[PDB]
Write a protein that binds this ligand. Structure first.
Ligand SMILES: CN1C(=O)[C@@H](NC(=O)[C@@H](NC(=O)c2cc(Cl)c(Cl)[nH]2)C2CCCCC2)COc2ccccc21
Ligand SMILES: [Cl-]
Length: 107
């Protein structure tokens, strides 16, 4: 039911320095690696998702504390998918945080 938009530089990645962000977040007690989620039937075709590096959280000494748990923060965002092969909502991991597990550790 919706119409026209211009796909250009104002709606695609122009960040050429991802290491600036990763070096900064690598100082987190719950740091993360990145999954390159590519789907050619989707706009952005590439979505970078956080994958927690550790099961526990990194302490002041540089060691892992297994009393805590590094966990993916989830968010729901909109993506365009090709119609015919349309606006779709998807759940994505946006980063990691350090939590005190109430029941189990998310692995
Ligand atoms: C690591 N990384 C990113 O995250 C990039 N972001 C995106 O390409 C796209 N957003 C994500 O993927 C994203 C959003 C959420 Cl919410 C999660 Cl989760 N993921 C973004 C591009 C611009 C249009 C809208 C989508 C930007 O910097 C980079 C540069 C080079 C290589 C990797 C990265
Ligand atoms: Cl890429």
């Amino acid at each position: 039911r919706t119409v026209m938009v211009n796909l250009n530089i104002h709606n695609r990645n122009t960040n050429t320095n991802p290491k600036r962000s990763s070096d900064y977040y690598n100082r987190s007690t719950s740091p993360w690696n990145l999954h390159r989620n590519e789907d050619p039937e989707r706009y952005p075709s590439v979505i970078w998702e956080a994958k927690c590096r550790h099961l526990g959280c990194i302490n002041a000494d540089g060691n892992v504390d297994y009393h805590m748990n590094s966990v993916p923060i989830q968010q729901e965002i909109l993506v365009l998918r090709r119609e015919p092969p349309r606006l779709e909502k998807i759940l994505v991991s946006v980063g990691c945080t350090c939590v005190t597990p109430i029941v189990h550790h998310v692995a």
